[PDB]
Symmetry: C2
Subunit: 152 residues, 2 copies
């Protein structure tokens, strides 16, 4: 029960595949565990300045993970970080794991001169909504999906 | 009134600064026109595979612009495109400009193997909401902002 948090680098594709499994198990979409990208693709993601993979380790086991994207802005020299997925092992809930990964993300943001971190949640994901409401400021917005298949 | 649409490259920082002015004027935030990043920063954005700047030209004038981010996914070898800003000159509305830039974005998505394009709107931006409702599928969601200043 000694938890370590870190940002994965491209030497850690093995721990990254294990974070992928955590997502699949926790979101029900094992979508995450078959059809995983090959090792070069994962390595290339971990090499980018614009993708942030964070993990919490129990021993060598991955018990929490967070994937976020850095969005370098165009109107001004500044950045925003967008949390895409965040999961914690079911056997490890209510132990501060999600909060520690978010805390590490803030340290990553500060190093990047990113001025805000933001994350989105569906109506009904009450854990998610409770966590983010404790940690940040809620706004409500609309999302639209567009199919590129219809290009003309 | 011959409109041309294209994706800017790093040789076109001049047209990109003009797209920045269109945003500032159209969103009221001229935030967009002072404090612009320097030319290397803009050039580096235009060099990335992960940032998409699209513009519509009347002569040499920029009359529409769209900034989007490609999000290479981690669970699977695939991508999503996230439209950040989209603006059209006030003297050029109701002429198909926004729709053409979105159409070009779909061609960019198809070339990238991106499978979806998505965009967000505030309750009350009825042009935006009407455009996106004609073009895609609305969902409603929550957004939370987190201040990295509080890292511990
Ligand atoms: C939400 C989740 C990240 C929680 O992780 P966690 O380590 O157990 O959270 P932490 O221990 O650091 O922080 C707990 C805080 O989150 C909130 N919360 C967490 N789980 C909750 C739950 N099951 N029910 C209600 N509120 C919850 C609370 O606000 C809580 O604060 P508190 O203990 O002071 O009341 C995750 O375990 C989960 O259950 N599902 C993943 C879904 C998700 O987060 N986002 C959508 C997937 S991308
Ligand atoms: C919204 C905006 C992109 C419209 O651009 P446009 O070139 O005039 O749009 P197009 O001519 O290609 O397409 C028109 C469609 O958009 C919708 N629409 C566009 N402007 C509208 C308006 N002012 N009022 C109501 N609906 C509008 C309609 O659905 C319309 O379809 P229709 O002509 O068949 O009824 C832009 O000009 C604007 O007014 N404000 C920018 C705000 C924004 O788009 N997003 C938030 C900023 S990031």
């Amino acid at each position: 029960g000694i938890i370590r948090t870190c940002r994965l680098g491209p030497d850690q594709v093995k721990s990254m595949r294990a974070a992928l499994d955590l997502f699949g198990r926790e979101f029900g979409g094992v979508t995450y565990s078959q059809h995983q990208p090959d090792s070069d693709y994962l390595g290339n993601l971990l090499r980018s300045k614009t993708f942030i993979a964070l993990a919490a380790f129990d021993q060598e086991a991955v018990v929490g993970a967070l994937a976020a994207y850095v969005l370098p802005k165009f109107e001004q020299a500044r950045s925003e970080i967008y949390i895409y997925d965040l999961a914690v092992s079911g056997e490890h809930r209510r132990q501060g794991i999600a909060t520690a990964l978010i805390n590490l993300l803030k340290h990553e943001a500060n190093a990047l001169g990113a001025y805000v971190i933001y994350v989105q949640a569906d109506y009904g994901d009450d854990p998610a909504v409770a966590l983010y409401t404790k940690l940040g400021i809620r706004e409500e917005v609309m999302h639209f999906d567009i199919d590129p298949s219809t290009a003309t």
